[PDB]
Amino acid sequence: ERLMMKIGVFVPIGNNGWLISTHAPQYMPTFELNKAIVQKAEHYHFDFALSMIKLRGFGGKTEFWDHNLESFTLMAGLAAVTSRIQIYATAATLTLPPAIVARMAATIDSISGGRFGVNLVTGWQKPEYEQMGIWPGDDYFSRRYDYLTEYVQVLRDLWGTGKSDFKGDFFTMNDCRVSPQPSVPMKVICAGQSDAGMAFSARYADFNFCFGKGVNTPTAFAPTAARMKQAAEQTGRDVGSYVLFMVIADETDDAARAKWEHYKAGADEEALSWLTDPTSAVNINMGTLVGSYASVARMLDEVASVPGAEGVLLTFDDFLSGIETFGERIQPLMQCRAHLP
């Protein structure tokens, strides 16, 4: 019952991170920026770094997510300039054959010395795929986890034995070979929120990402983590929840709130239209923690007490300064991080 929680950083592979506002920091996703971010996160003992994959943006004044790097190649570069932090890339399974993902994962396993894992996603936004002629049709919405189930069986064969003879509705392996196999058991993580998605995660994932909920209501996601725990019961597997939040912290509650309101007041409404104390569309209605460093520490400790919650995935309004103030001012106050040096 002693508080212990893992901390990850959701790295800005897309421009402007997760704020859709002309008052938010404006920046392009460069390798050097993400290198600075992940090296600083590693310095402050963040447990992992994850990048999403986003194949189409939302336009507007800030050209929001119009500029995005590719996840496996970004994480391969970050693996080469880190030494301790876990590194996860996202595979949009419609865009990469499973044997290619299998070999890419083995490659970054080699780059990182065993620190690499894969976030498997089905894809949900039809424009990302229709734009390049690979959308399977609106049958995909209901069948996508059948597809993902075949996909991961191929991956598990290849990582586990170096070969696959899997034959299904979507893939045909005829003694497919991928070697080297990963030096350590390959980590698979998933971000399913639906019943079907959580059932997939319960069978195949090491843990499951879910959305934090509300502004300064850190435990509001609890029913989602409860559903994941029950999905995991149905496989007997230990598959905890990692919860996505944005942290907007400052010296005082008032100063942090002033920033949050300043961001909301610059909302890039044209971009928000394309994408279409309450949450705000300015950060895609993300669960948000806004307060003094001590207030954010207290609220993150609350997250750690939720049944099934094993970690948080953090975005910030400003990653370079936000990681620094998290490491210097927030994390030392967190009971659930007392295990760190």
Added chain:
Amino acid sequence: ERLMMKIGVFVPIGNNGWLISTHAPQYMPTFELNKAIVQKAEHYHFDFALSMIKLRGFGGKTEFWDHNLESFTLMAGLAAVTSRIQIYATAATLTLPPAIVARMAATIDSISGGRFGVNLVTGWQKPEYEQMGIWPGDDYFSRRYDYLTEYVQVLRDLWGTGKSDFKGDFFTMNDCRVSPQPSVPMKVICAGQSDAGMAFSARYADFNFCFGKGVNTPTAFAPTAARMKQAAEQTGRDVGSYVLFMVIADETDDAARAKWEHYKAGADEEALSWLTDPTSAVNINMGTLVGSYASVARMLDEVASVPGAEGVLLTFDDFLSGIETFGERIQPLMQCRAHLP
């Protein structure tokens, strides 16, 4: 007419490099080995590093190319730990959608600061693709450069304008978007030996790889480079030849020959069966230069005089020692490298 030639290293992304022999150095392709190789090549002013993609091996006593990393992720890692050498990854175009390759190339452009390019290949070995159910059928042999022509049109649209509406027999783009665009014009290279392959390279490539020929007959490839020059005439484009050789050099001709014979005497005949002063199957009948450091320097200077030859792509019997003796003993004697510091 003053000798000037570029030098590249063909990095061992597959186990044991390019020797199929129990008397050859035995090693796995690791990131750390390829990092040591490319950093040493960069130190000696090699112009570029290229990795192939090989999705299935040939077995035998040495499990030859049974163990292979993936090219884009390997080169992304190498880009992060280099600063001057050009970095090329190979895309087997049947395995990756063009918009994904486009974004991966933009990503390694960002990692490398503008040092990245793509070697586009159609694929030729049916088992590499049939094993994962993606071989298009034996029509592909005659249509593969039609396919590659559509593929590169999509790439050129995306790198050039950030978007594509290309519609063809093999791809359908509906306002496909990839941004960021590369910071510098994206380099495309090809390795076509056939009439159709050279015609593709003449239209779309910056240069074309061809095979060196014979043992210690450095200019024997000349008719191939002559055919490439004539293909380039038909587009008005400047598309030179880069010639693949293995270098087996030592203090004396006799010592280098003794190594070459020692390698041939350990030929892994079971692996050679699967793959199926003369060239030898022990290095896939590669053009090979065997001699003292001074003899190899003289022969490489001969290569530089061949019409159309602009560079060489080098393998070695031992990459770590071979790059060192190339930099310390061979390159200082090469008239075509007198431009280096």
